[PDB]
Amino acid sequence: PVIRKFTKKNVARAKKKYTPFSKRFKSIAAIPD
DNA sequence: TATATACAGTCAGTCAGTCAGTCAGTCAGTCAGTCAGTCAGTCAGTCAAGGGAAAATAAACAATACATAACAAAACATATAAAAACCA
């Protein structure tokens, strides 16, 4: 029923992440080398 | 001889004339107060130049307005993979 007011389909979205490394150890002691 | 009645005389009051003051009603000067033309002096209406600042002109020179080209910035909008919830 809805209509998008303007289309982007030839987009090529890149599979790249927004979570930095700062948020996959969660502590100073929690980090490997 | 004396007393009572009437008539005529006599004073006084009343009646009429004499003359010397007096005031109302006019006559009228005169004196003063108020109305007519000349002129001479007053006074504003009117017919003309001309003074002079505004208006117009001109020329060299300066400042502002207008239309637009280029762009900056903020609101409105979508898409999809990715986090993080979030169902189950």
What's the resolution in A? 4.4
Ramachandran class of A30: left when φ > 0, alpha when ψ lies in -120 to 50, beta otherwise: alpha
First vs last Cα of chain A: how many Å apart? 54
Those nucleotides of strand B lying less than 7 Å from any protein Cβ are 77-84
Q: Which of chain A's residues 1-33 bind strand B, using a 7 Å CB cutoff?
A: 4-9, 11, 13, 15-19, 23
Experimental approach was cryo-EM
Q: How far is CA A11 from CA A5, A8, A21, A30, in A?
A: 16, 6, 27, 38
Place of tokens 């599979």: A15
Which amino acid belongs to residue A10? N
Q: String of b and e for A7-28 (b: at least 16 CB within 10 Å)?
A: eeeeeeeeeeeeeeeeeeeeee
Q: Which nucleotide across the nucleic acid strands is nearest to A17, CA versus C1'?
A: B82
Cα(A23)–Cα(A16) distance, integer angstroms: 16
Decide: A25 and A31 in contact? Cβ < 8 Å: yes
Q: Which nucleotide across the nucleic acid strands is nearest to A15, CA versus C1'?
A: B81
DSSP secondary structure letters along chain A? ----SS---S----------GGGSS-SGGG---
